[PDB]
């Protein structure tokens, strides 16, 4: 494979200033005529001048308006076009090429593609050269003046970034549109739409300065009824920005636009967000509440890019994390502030400790900032965008909010209308944080591991109390696993947010105080402390590693009933679950293996089932915090701790645990599941698309994990509650009663009801289908085939695939099935997904992360589909190295 090191960056010989478009869409064809003014640059060594275009047919190639001739000025092999130095001028030219492109046929969504009846683009990573000739990488920035012809009747709204500046008719029923971007820009953030689009709007003033901003976001006429959500949160995201960052939005218009087929969430282009519709619509009627979280995060993130992207954008892709993992994180603390509930931060602690520290424990693992790529389309991963997350927040941890923002400031404005790279943001911090602690001589650079050192940090803790002396210490040690990218590995600077609580009172001993570990351990020492302490660590989850407590289980008890910090009582009950899931794993996996006739399994503690008790029955405790404690871990967080496993030792783990806890709580439960339906299935808000209460949609989700756990245990008369559930008008309770309607015979009658429901909204029937996919039912195989046939069928949209194939993907008992039907079944997916949209295609390969964690005969079996995908001819560069990288080819 061809590879791309971080080492080897070097400037461009050549400059190119304007890009000047004209699009002229056609029903067979798309016609696009470039100019780029350009110039030569001051590292320019007389080298041949080289284009990046991918699959373009080219009309017509000229320089200063001097024809140039295949073999003889340039040569075209469909990725580059290569002029000839003797061509290349030696100062200001314009290179002018026309090209025909078919987004009609263009399956892979990346490029000018048509979804449904709208003609849309993906630039970002390298789709613009799928468009045009480019120098297509992010530090070649421009100004774009961009022109877009095309029918009338089938394609009235015509949008481009930036103001739009004419309209007007041409013959033959076509009209056209041109637009001007006065903000430079890489072509990564290039965009047009055209199609039957319809509207809200409305006006946004900017705090400071008070200009008139447009808002408008858009989508096919059948759907518009479900913009209002979008057009509230990036009213939202632009109020936040202003008020924490003082950032404010810099063109007098904005558009979002919704479309069925995409890759990924949403993108940035300046001007012109375009959204998988599955992020951008949602309406109370029609869509589950995870639709509001999820579009109130994804309108936020793309709004945040307008600067840290946009306005400040990457010297070159290894900077990635540089934009992704700065905007997660001003992502993240937007949909804190909104949603006010703690539920949130867990929620993201949960997704990184599960998926993230999997990568990071996969042949797959790599630094924030990678040293190397076939296709950079593979480094959009949960590492970039979710460790790099947590790393943007250390800095925010270890500065405090006032030195935090004075930090970032310093970065947005230095490098304001260009480039940047980690260093410049470290950079920054290193600024804010010699102010901080009044030192010139402070600095960050040991920080500068945290991008280039892959792998999770370990963290370990012992404790000592002295009570003559009233003094308590706290003895620190970290590790970080030698991995393939370094072998060797570093001691990180890591924040350790800690409390301390009085284990008799359940009381606050010491002013939170942020511990800065440099070493690869230290003491920490507290004085005037009147009591043994039980210490409360890693507060907030301030910094991404495994925490090993060394605490009691009586201990982590008294945490979980008493501690502030809600990350804190979450991880006391995780490390809990997790102590028992081990126990009782190997005590399954021992009797396995011998042959036992009879064995003894740990029960579950007692005193940890009072607790959580003691927590579901107070009326002013958290909802949300209540549907954590009742859950086990994920499955992808307890993988982490476990090789060779036996899924099918596992799956039999947690029934029993659950089954214990429920042997005890299910009364509570049920009572519980009653008595929250009032508040919460409460219609206030049910027509107001503009205001979501967040505690109350946390109530739903606690009434409908109840539910689960009480109909998989079976309890008396469930139901007859299942049924009244199904009948709720909202779609999260109903179609929660058709998972939890798996356990009995009224499955198949819930699934017609709620199919019929469904079908008549795009975005509901693949939640729906989602819903089937994940249902707990031994013909899960069979029903499969059933969505295939009668609904999947041979869809290309991403979302489709996704709904009807991932969820299964999680069923721990079924997926895993010792004859590898599950991995023939996703591997065949794969396979079919990669001949024409080659990102899906890899996002389908997920469950294979895990492969060299499993017992050997599911190594075996994940290895054999794995080599026979690499087998498959015409394999796309994307999955072929994700899949050679995968299985330690590459
Ligand atoms: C929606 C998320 C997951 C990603 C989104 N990024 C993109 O749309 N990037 C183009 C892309 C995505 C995934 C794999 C490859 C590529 Cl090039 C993003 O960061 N938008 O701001
Ligand atoms: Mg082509
Ligand atoms: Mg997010
Ligand atoms: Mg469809
Ligand atoms: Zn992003």
């Given at each position: 494979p061809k590879i791309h090191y971080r080492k080897d960056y070097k400037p461009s010989g050549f400059?190119?200033?304007?890009?000047?478009?004209?699009?002229?869409?056609?029903?067979?064809?798309?016609?696009?005529?470039?100019?780029?003014?350009?110039?030569?640059?001051?590292?320019?060594?007389?080298?041949d001048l080289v284009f990046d275009g991918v699959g373009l047919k080219i009309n017509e190639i000229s320089i200063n308006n001097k024809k140039l001739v295949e073999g003889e000025e340039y040569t075209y092999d469909n990725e580059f076009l290569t002029i000839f130095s003797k061509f290349v001028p030696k100062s200001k030219f314009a290179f002018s090429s026309e090209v025909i492109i078919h987004p009609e046929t263009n399956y892979a969504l990346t490029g000018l593609?048509?979804?449904?009846?709208?003609?849309?683009?993906?630039?970002?990573?390298?789709?613009?050269?799928?468009?045009?000739?480019?120098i297509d990488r992010p530090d070649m920035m421009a100004k774009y003046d961009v022109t877009v012809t095309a029918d009338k009747e089938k394609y009235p709204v015509l949008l481009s970034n930036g103001d739009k500046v004419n309209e007007f008719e041409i013959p033959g029923g076509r009209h056209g549109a041109r637009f001007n971007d006065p903000h430079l820009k890489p072509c990564y953030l290039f965009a047009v739409v055209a199609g039957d689009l319809k509207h809200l709007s409305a006006t946004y003033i900017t705090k400071y300065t008070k200009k008139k901003v447009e808002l408008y976001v858009f989508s096919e006429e059948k759907y518009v009824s479900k913009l209002q959500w979008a057009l509230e949160c990036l009213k939202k995201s632009m109020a936040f920005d202003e008020d924490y960052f003082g950032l404010e939005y810099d063109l007098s218009r904005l558009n979002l636009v919704a479309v069925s087929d995409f890759n990924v969430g949403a993108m940035e282009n300046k001007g012109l967000n375009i959204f998988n519709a599955n992020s951008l619509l949602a309406s109370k009627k029609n869509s589950?509440?995870?639709?509001?979280?999820?579009?109130?995060?994804?309108?936020?993130?793309?709004?945040?890019?307008?600067?840290?992207?946009?306005?400040?954008?990457?010297?070159?892709?290894?900077?990635?994390?540089?934009?992704?993992?700065?905007?997660?994180?001003?992502?993240?603390?937007?949909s804190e502030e909104m949603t006010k509930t703690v539920t949130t931060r867990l929620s993201h602690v949960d997704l990184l400790r599960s998926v993230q520290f999997l990568?990071?424990?996969?042949?797959?693992?790599?630094?924030?900032?990678?040293?190397?790529?076939?296709?950079?389309?593979?480094?959009?991963?949960?590492?970039?965008?979710?460790?790099?997350?947590?790393?943007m927040r250390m800095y925010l941890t270890i500065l405090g909010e006032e030195y935090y923002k004075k930090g970032f400031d310093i970065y947005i404005k230095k490098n304001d209308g260009n480039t940047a790279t980690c260093e410049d943001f470290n950079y920054a911090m290193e600024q804010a944080y010699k102010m901080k602690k009044a030192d010139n001589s402070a600095n960050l650079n040991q920080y500068l591991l945290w991008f280039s050192q892959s792998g999770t940090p370990h963290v370990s803790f012992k404790y000592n109390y002295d009570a003559e002396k009233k003094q308590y210490s706290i003895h620190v040690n970290q590790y970080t696993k030698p991995d393939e990218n370094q072998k060797e590995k570093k001691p990180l600077f890591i924040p350790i947010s800690v409390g301390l609580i009085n284990p008799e009172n359940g009381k606050e001993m010491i002013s939170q105080t942020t511990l800065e570990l440099t070493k690869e351990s230290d003491t920490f020492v507290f004085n005037n402390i009147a009591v043994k302490p039980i210490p409360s660590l890693f507060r907030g989850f301030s910094?991404?590693?495994?925490?090993?407590?060394?605490?009691?289980?009586?201990?982590?008890?008294l945490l979980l009933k008493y501690d502030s910090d809600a990350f804190v009582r979450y991880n006391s009950c995780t490390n809990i679950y997790m102590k028992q899931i081990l126990m009782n794993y190997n005590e399954f996996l021992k009797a396995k293996n011998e042959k036992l006739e009879s064995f003894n399994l740990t029960p579950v503690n007692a005193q940890f089932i009072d607790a959580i008790k003691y927590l579901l029955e107070d009326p002013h405790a958290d909802a949300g915090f209540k549907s954590y404690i009742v859950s086990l871990p994920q499955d992808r967080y307890i993988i982490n701790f476990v090789s060779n496993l036996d899924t099918d030792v596992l799956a039999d783990t947690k029934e029993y645990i659950y089954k214990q806890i429920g042997d005890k709580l299910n009364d509570v439960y049920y009572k519980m599941f009653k008595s929250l339906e009032a508040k919460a299935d409460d219609l206030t808000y049910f027509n107001d698309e503009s205001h979501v209460d967040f505690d109350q949609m946390n109530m739903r989700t606690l009434r409908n994990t109840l539910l689960s756990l009480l109909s998989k245990a079976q309890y008396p008369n469930i139901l007859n509650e299942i049924i009244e559930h199904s009948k709720s008008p909202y779609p999260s309770n109903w179609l929660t009663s058709l998972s939890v309607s798996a356990y009995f015979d009224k499955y198949f009658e819930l699934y017609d009801k709620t199919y019929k429901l469904s079908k008549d909204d795009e975005l509901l029937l693949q939640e729906w289908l989602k819903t089937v996919s994940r249902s707990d039912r031994k013909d899960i195989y069979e029903i499969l085939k059933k969505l295939e046939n009668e609904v999947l069928k041979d869809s290309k949209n991403p979302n489709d695939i996704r709904a009807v194939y991932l969820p299964f993907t999680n069923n721990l008992r079924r997926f895993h099935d010792i004859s590898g039907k599950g991995?023939?079944?996703?591997?065949?997916?794969?396979?079919?997904?990669?001949?024409?949209?080659?990102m899906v295609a890899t996002q389908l390969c997920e469950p294979f992360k895990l492969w060299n964690k499993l017992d050997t005969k599911r190594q075996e079996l994940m290895l054999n589909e794995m080599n026979t995908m690499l087998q498959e001819p015409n394999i796309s560069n994307n999955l072929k190295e994700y899949l050679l990288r995968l299985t330690n080819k590459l």
């Open positions: 400059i190119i200033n304007n890009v000047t478009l004209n699009i002229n869409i056609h029903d067979n064809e798309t016609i696009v005529r470039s100019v780029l003014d350009m110039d030569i640059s001051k590292h320019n060594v007389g080298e593609y048509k979804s449904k009846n709208i003609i849309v683009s993906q630039c970002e990573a390298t789709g613009f050269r799928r468009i045009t000739f480019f589950i509440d995870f639709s509001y979280a999820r579009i109130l995060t994804v309108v936020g993130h793309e709004y945040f890019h307008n600067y840290t992207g946009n306005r400040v954008t990457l010297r070159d892709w290894f900077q990635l994390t540089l934009k992704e993992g700065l905007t997660v994180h001003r992502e993240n603390l937007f990568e990071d424990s996969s042949p797959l693992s790599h630094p924030i900032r990678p040293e190397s790529y076939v296709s950079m389309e593979n480094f959009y991963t949960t590492t970039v965008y979710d460790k790099g997350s947590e790393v910094a991404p590693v495994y925490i090993e407590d060394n605490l009691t289980d009586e201990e982590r008890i991995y023939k079944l996703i591997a065949e997916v794969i396979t079919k997904t990669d001949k024409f949209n080659p």
